[PDB]
Amino acid sequence: RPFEFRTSVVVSTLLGLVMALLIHFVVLSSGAFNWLRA
């Protein structure tokens, strides 16, 4: 069974998840938007 397709989709999903988490934390810790403020 070829290993190319499963590897590609797994690495794509991991990249997307990591990038989304990183961007969300960067935006949260900047204070530009109101979002979760005391």
Partner: protein, 50 residues
């Protein structure tokens, strides 16, 4: 089994892989549309380029 998959990509995909690939591309398109809407709403809230 190589059926319903076009001959161009037969040396790569089966039929089950074809169905999974179709699901993946549909998910990608839906996510792209929702992301565009989200960015428009966030820009309307607070623009980040001035």
């Amino acid at each position: 089994q190589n059926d319903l998959v076009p001959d161009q990509w037969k040396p790569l995909f089966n039929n089950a892989e074809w169905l999974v690939h179709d699901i993946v591309v549909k998910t990608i398109y839906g996510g792209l549309i929702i992301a565009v809407i989200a960015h428009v709403l966030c820009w309307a809230w607070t623009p980040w380029i001035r």
